[PDB]
Design a protein around this ligand. Sequence first.
Ligand SMILES: Cc1cc2nc3c(=O)[nH]c(=O)nc-3n(C[C@H](O)[C@H](O)[C@H](O)COP(=O)(O)OP(=O)(O)OC[C@H]3O[C@@H](n4cnc5c(N)ncnc54)[C@H](O)[C@@H]3O)c2cc1C
Ligand SMILES: Cc1cc2nc3c(=O)[nH]c(=O)nc-3n(C[C@H](O)[C@H](O)[C@H](O)COP(=O)(O)OP(=O)(O)OC[C@H]3O[C@@H](n4cnc5c(N)ncnc54)[C@H](O)[C@@H]3O)c2cc1C
Ligand SMILES: Cc1cc2nc3c(=O)[nH]c(=O)nc-3n(C[C@H](O)[C@H](O)[C@H](O)COP(=O)(O)OP(=O)(O)OC[C@H]3O[C@@H](n4cnc5c(N)ncnc54)[C@H](O)[C@@H]3O)c2cc1C
Ligand SMILES: Cc1cc2nc3c(=O)[nH]c(=O)nc-3n(C[C@H](O)[C@H](O)[C@H](O)COP(=O)(O)OP(=O)(O)OC[C@H]3O[C@@H](n4cnc5c(N)ncnc54)[C@H](O)[C@@H]3O)c2cc1C
Lengths: 459, 459, 459, 459
Amino acid sequence: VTRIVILGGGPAGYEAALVAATSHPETTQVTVIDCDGIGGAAVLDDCVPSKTFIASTGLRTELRRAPHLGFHKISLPQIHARVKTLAAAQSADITAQLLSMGVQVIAGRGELIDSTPGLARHRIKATAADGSTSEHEADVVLVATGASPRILPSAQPDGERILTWRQLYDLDALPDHLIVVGSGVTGAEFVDAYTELGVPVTVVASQDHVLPYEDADAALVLEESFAERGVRLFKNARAASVTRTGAGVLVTMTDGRTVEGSHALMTIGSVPNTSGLGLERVGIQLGRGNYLTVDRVSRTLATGIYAAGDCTGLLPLASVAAMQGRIAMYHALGEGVSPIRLRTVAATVFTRPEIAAVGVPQSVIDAGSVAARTIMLPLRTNARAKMSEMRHGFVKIFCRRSTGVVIGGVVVAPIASELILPIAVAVQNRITVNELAQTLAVYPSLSGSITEAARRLMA
Amino acid sequence: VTRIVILGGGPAGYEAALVAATSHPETTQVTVIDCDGIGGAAVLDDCVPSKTFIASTGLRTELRRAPHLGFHKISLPQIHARVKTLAAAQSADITAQLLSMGVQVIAGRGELIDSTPGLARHRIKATAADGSTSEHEADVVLVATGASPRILPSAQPDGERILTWRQLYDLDALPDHLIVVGSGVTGAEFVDAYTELGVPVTVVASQDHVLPYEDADAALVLEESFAERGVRLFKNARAASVTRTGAGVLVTMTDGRTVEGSHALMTIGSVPNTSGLGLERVGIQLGRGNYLTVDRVSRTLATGIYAAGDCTGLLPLASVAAMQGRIAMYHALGEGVSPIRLRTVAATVFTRPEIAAVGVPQSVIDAGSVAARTIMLPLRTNARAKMSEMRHGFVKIFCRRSTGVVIGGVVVAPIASELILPIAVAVQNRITVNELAQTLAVYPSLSGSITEAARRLMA
Amino acid sequence: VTRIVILGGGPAGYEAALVAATSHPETTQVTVIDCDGIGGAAVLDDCVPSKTFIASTGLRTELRRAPHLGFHKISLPQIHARVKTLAAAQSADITAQLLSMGVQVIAGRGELIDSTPGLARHRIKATAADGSTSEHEADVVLVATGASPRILPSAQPDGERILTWRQLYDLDALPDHLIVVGSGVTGAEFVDAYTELGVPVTVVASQDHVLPYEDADAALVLEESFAERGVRLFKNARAASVTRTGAGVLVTMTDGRTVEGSHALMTIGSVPNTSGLGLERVGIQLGRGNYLTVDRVSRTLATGIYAAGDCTGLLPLASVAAMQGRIAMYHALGEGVSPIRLRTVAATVFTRPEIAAVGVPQSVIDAGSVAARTIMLPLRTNARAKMSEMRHGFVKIFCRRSTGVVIGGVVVAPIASELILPIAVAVQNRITVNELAQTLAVYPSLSGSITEAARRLMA
Amino acid sequence: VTRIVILGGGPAGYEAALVAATSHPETTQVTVIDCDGIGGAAVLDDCVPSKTFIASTGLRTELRRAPHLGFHKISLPQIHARVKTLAAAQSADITAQLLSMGVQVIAGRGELIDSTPGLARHRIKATAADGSTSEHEADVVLVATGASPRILPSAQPDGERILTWRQLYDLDALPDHLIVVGSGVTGAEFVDAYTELGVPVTVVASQDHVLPYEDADAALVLEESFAERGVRLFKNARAASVTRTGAGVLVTMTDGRTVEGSHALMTIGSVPNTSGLGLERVGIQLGRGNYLTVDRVSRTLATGIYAAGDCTGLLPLASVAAMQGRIAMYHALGEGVSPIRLRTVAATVFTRPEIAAVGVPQSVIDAGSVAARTIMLPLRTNARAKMSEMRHGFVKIFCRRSTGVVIGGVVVAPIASELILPIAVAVQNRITVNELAQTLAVYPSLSGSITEAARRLMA
Ligand SMILES: Cc1cc2nc3c(=O)[nH]c(=O)nc-3n(C[C@H](O)[C@H](O)[C@H](O)COP(=O)(O)OP(=O)(O)OC[C@H]3O[C@@H](n4cnc5c(N)ncnc54)[C@H](O)[C@@H]3O)c2cc1C
Ligand SMILES: Cc1cc2nc3c(=O)[nH]c(=O)nc-3n(C[C@H](O)[C@H](O)[C@H](O)COP(=O)(O)OP(=O)(O)OC[C@H]3O[C@@H](n4cnc5c(N)ncnc54)[C@H](O)[C@@H]3O)c2cc1C
Ligand SMILES: Cc1cc2nc3c(=O)[nH]c(=O)nc-3n(C[C@H](O)[C@H](O)[C@H](O)COP(=O)(O)OP(=O)(O)OC[C@H]3O[C@@H](n4cnc5c(N)ncnc54)[C@H](O)[C@@H]3O)c2cc1C
Ligand SMILES: Cc1cc2nc3c(=O)[nH]c(=O)nc-3n(C[C@H](O)[C@H](O)[C@H](O)COP(=O)(O)OP(=O)(O)OC[C@H]3O[C@@H](n4cnc5c(N)ncnc54)[C@H](O)[C@@H]3O)c2cc1C
């Protein structure tokens, strides 16, 4: 009976407990210790709440679009009910899954409490919201505590007017004029969301683009998308402060530059939740930025102790958190282990249209660092695209020059988040464009355009 | 120079020409003799249009689902106008590609006119609608004439009340009571589409279900669905005839009972367009079903002569027709060749929800004929599904017992036609559930469930 | 810096160190504490020497086969001198590599001396033959102590007449009548070697054959061979004792009958060198057979503590010992890890001819447990074989029923130990008979038969 | 019943008939028509006779080598008996194989006799040595007639003193001083063979090396080998003439340069046997040099007619002849077809030691045309090498930089012809050095050095 105690039940923590319970039923004993809610911030506060929200926003799009398709009060509070609700329901499903796999699930905060630094088998005191405490022996420990919203002391949030992304679903009415500070992917997604609801938005970006995408082609597509929809924009701006004004907020840059609005949404980074964990008791020193630096097999510098997800700093994606957790267990439980390769991550930006990519960026290729052949197929010639009235979406594919091995791709379409999977497995399993061009994809489908992109790179 | 002449311009033909002219610009001369216009019936008549029609129908589905989301006349002629219009563009895009790729398109009906029956190089005649005629030499000949609606002489279509699916978009008003004769995928799809436009439907099915379907679990999802939305069906009945009554239509079936609707949609099958082609002049004799029996490498029993598409009877899907023309060009132009394997074909029924499958059916695994592990993962626990308010979708993945190689998969969800692709890649490339499980699919998406599906199959 | 201390320097150890120091020059400090000298018994005692001895024997085989080819004193002491001499060089080459790679080699016997039993970092003590002693800290510990000859107290080896295989090269003359006790691979090999030097041999086998062997067809090839060359055997008998007579030796077996030779070679098994290591100080308790039970990832039940080689009892082949040390370094240094699969191990018996096998035995396929296709291709039709005057060699390849993936192979020929490799690659990498069949092996060679073997399995 | 008639039964012809008969038993009818003897020149005159001969030569090597290994009249005619004999026996085995597979086997010369040029089904008149004739209908035709020794009109052979490689086995006594004209692989092999028998040899090379190997390393190994064994050498020499002298031969260069000897062995090229075939009757024009130019799928410019082996000019190796034939049938019979890639050919030079290589040459890599990592492992540190007293053999391996995919290798050892297979399948099936380093090769073996070469390239 090897004991596995996991601090945090978000995706790094939960998907880890799931691999441990499933693969080793009678050999192991898995204990998740989470303070805020199974599914973590991923499910109850950030990722699932933003996507649910964005998803809801869509409707207004397809409504203003029905008359030409032959078919002749937007109440914020209920949209929000759906958000808090679906989020809670996700969390409920996951809590169930864990329980039905023998996973012990405790509500409370965790902390290493090792009597001394060189112990092989560790100890974790779990303190409940119910005041009560409980200690647990652990052969394996996985620190999976996530991150919290970084906060600028010149822009301290309220929940009223200066808001972090978690406070949004607490607003009554749509804002009169939303000011998003911070460009970057999540700042972008909200600019697009609030834009679809009819809310005036002004972005305060660092560089030139409301969102600078490593793939130029797609980035330009969203830029046009934004101008054409009224997004206002401050290029090369750093919020010096965000004070509360008479009726709204006053955002002032470091240039002297200013912009007023009814609300300010702080879309800065996040910070690893890595304090008060006891890491000291076990000899661990947080690396730069306070992340718990981990290796390719998810392990910390102390023995038997693993770390995963946002608290480790690798990549702020729940998918990468899940795999790090999944990996830390395959390693500790003696199974095959394949380190996570940053270039096999599928990442998507949920704007309209979605941008998803996996593999070697086109820049890198256009710099001779990586030889490869490339193709960009415009989705307009595709009949499914046509039925979904897609106008500037395309599929890009990048393969090695000599072998035809798929090494990246970019997709800009309404469901790029799903169309990317196929290219990801190709990159992840050295599949050739020849092999890909061979798969009999469904007609009329957007994915048949993936199949031809590759068919065209054959050589 | 090798002379390629293709009879017929739908997926089989036009995309055999595409491969021909694209990979061998200077060693070939490709001529496509098609009578109805590039894209063939798949694009101009059957496939592209029904999917268009069904996509428009979709809007209604959503729309009145506005309240759950915080929000809150049907003009058939403009839907139809969009149906012809879009069809026309899909056809124009393809013609332009063939044309700029240097393919010689000849609008007309072509036929073989060989002197004796045993020659290497063939001779084809194109007859224009102008009565005019040109003759053409052919080193390689590709018969891609497709199929046509089957017709019951006791229920001859009439364009107004007795309708084939090609005729539906000629109506200027929704039927009062639609009677659909024939259970199958294409009757299933329209019953679903019309039920969504609010039309009453009565099916006269030959089988047990409106949509008989290989995978039981999918079948049920749809059976329960038509039944709730109130679709009426007479199981195991065939229409003895379809007469025209006062203002409606009288359907009479072989058992004597009768039903009455405003219109009757004949949804039987189709017939191969293989007559009057001069296949006699070259020694071929139409096989069972009047089909131009073909190879696994797309060739007929006569040398230099290939066929592909519905006119061969392999499978009536356009995706299969395209690979058949594609593989016939590959075999005739000395390139690498891989025969089509029926169990790699991915196929979807376009209902709401969609149903797609690939590889070994669960039927077989359960009979003991194939040694495999199987899993059925509901989609409702998936956050993305929760967002698209899916409660009955699911992912089924099947795999080899020992090796874990993916051999089949079934997907029932709103975009199954897209998500099936990754599975096909796995099937067509013997990818392993382990291999699939390491792919960092995106979160949150329904495709993440596909990687969990295989993750759990790991052994 | 992570401190690696390896107890024992044979394939398990020295080649765990090699991997250690070669891939992580600056993050590690590798110390190898070995008492007999780098290369261990595999190189200095058992493996390398018998193969050397057998290779010398080979010359005689050939030589008097001079007439068929147009052509046409045995000095045991110089053969033996070549046996020690070559052994010595193999050991010197390895020491030099370890040494220049910066590995700290310490000649001595090492043991665990941990204070309490539950620590992360361990402590080892090396005792020199000088009585001297040094102590060493160990983050990672690798127990690679190998095995020693089993000894029957009623037939204690004496160096002169009662011999273990380690002692054979101490004789200055060929035995008059060699009695070999114990049927097994290592008795089989020596019976063959001595029969070739012209020595009379009488085997007291516990089993049915001198060389009991998994694959029937191979077994026979050798049974017929020993029988023709006149090897004498008492089947199913165990030696009750081995006494020393006048000038020879009296072997008495449990049934009462007796045999008389000049010498007795005890060919029983060996015993794991797992005593006096201080495994108690760390919580381990020797498993069944006094073996240091290990993982599939080479780790013991104590953290930081790994084992590999004969002392674990996985498989007594040096090739298996080396992968065990190799995989223990990979798991401890956070690299990619793939557990050893027993059915990928390739193993050969060094008789004349050689016999090598890999993967599923034909035994199993024939029982119905594994669903496979099999073929046995004699080698005599192969031109190369005709040249090396082989009349009973053959190649057996086994493959998955549906997929055609290679899952086993057996090769009986003069260099089977080399030709088995390609098959192992196929087994270990799920290569397909189709995939193998396209490899342009060389003509003429016996390996061309391997590609035909799979070619015929194609389906 | 598709009819397949093959002109020539060497490896191109025979291995083709074997694939056709085996895969299509009741669908086909296979007819080989060969004039000289099944196995063709490959078996009855060139390749198998030279290897058998070389093999025989070895003995003298290992005899002069026995005294230090502890063991204290070379009649040419019998060595030759073995040669003619084994060659005839090979031929006998193959004739049997064909017969037992339903293949019809006719002795006689073949000729196309097509009534006219555009026939789909061809005709072949077979003329017997027995004067008699016979005609055969053919749906598929495979021209596989091999090549003949090119002959210099200034150096017309005798069979006495000026000899082609086929006349050698007709000599009574070993030559007094053999003069080989022509460097290149086969000229080399004979220099090595006659050298091992004690025969003085003088080579007349074009460039600087008795044999210029694309792999410098190995070439230098043979060069040293030759100087150290007495091979005399004329650098940059072209035989102007080879006249018969008083007692022997007088070879005079174009420089004015001369050298006398007892015999002259003409090792120039060979010429395709492509005359009198009727190729005219079917419209085929021989390409340059009179080769029957074929494509990647083994087909000629006439339909239904395939060509393979030496008569086509691709590569003068029986292995490449076999695959071309094997491929021409897979293509005609509608099976999967994979064109032959010149860079997946394993070629070996049978000298002592053998040189075998497959893949990208090291030159090409050392010219940045191909990025790759490389390694050269000297075989001296290997224990099996040591037992075979190998002194300058090594294993080279070349993998892509980014993926670790094996792309070539060179082996210089006593059985390089067999050790190369494993590297060939790796190159041919994109196997990674990681995968290769994972295969548990047999210890002590030469092939374990292949496994470490790759282990060392991991990254
Ligand atoms: C607005 C926004 C949108 C995003 N959208 C996406 C997206 O579309 N796709 C994607 O892949 N990623 C997305 N991300 C990123 C993704 O949310 C994170 O990568 C992922 O949440 C990190 O998961 P985790 O399991 O490491 O940590 P978390 O999910 O953040 O949770 C760790 C949990 O552990 C608990 N915890 C903390 N300290 C302790 C303690 N001492 N004891 C017990 N429990 C403790 C808490 O309850 C906490 O919820 C988004 C992020 C934001 C902010
Ligand atoms: C209602 C319906 C819905 C469908 N939905 C799907 C779907 O969702 N997905 C899918 O994959 N498949 C679908 N199919 C099937 C798919 O459309 C067919 O498999 C495909 O159309 C066949 O293509 P083809 O190129 O072989 O023939 P076709 O597309 O039928 O066209 C051959 C063309 O050649 C021409 N032609 C005929 N005779 C001659 C001649 N003598 N000379 C010159 N030209 C000639 C015609 O102009 C004709 O249009 C559907 C079918 C129907 C009936
Ligand atoms: C006659 C014979 C023939 C064989 N032929 C083959 C063959 O052809 N192929 C094959 O693959 N295998 C063969 N094997 C088996 C193979 O030799 C073993 O599998 C392999 O030797 C085991 O290697 P190891 O490194 O684990 O241990 P070893 O090679 O046995 O050595 C471990 C070493 O560690 C040392 N040691 C022991 N205790 C301590 C201690 N306390 N501190 C420090 N050092 C210690 C010793 O000096 C010893 O030499 C043969 C075996 C025998 C007996
Ligand atoms: C000295 C020497 C050594 C070699 N060593 C090797 C080696 O080690 N490895 C290797 O791979 N290659 C080697 N080769 C090359 C190899 O021999 C050739 O690649 C191979 O023989 C070609 O085979 P093929 O089947 O195309 O032709 P062939 O084997 O040459 O035979 C064609 C046959 O067809 C017959 N034929 C000709 N015309 C007609 C007709 N009209 N009708 C009927 N039959 C006809 C003849 O009987 C003839 O034998 C060597 C060559 C030489 C000269």
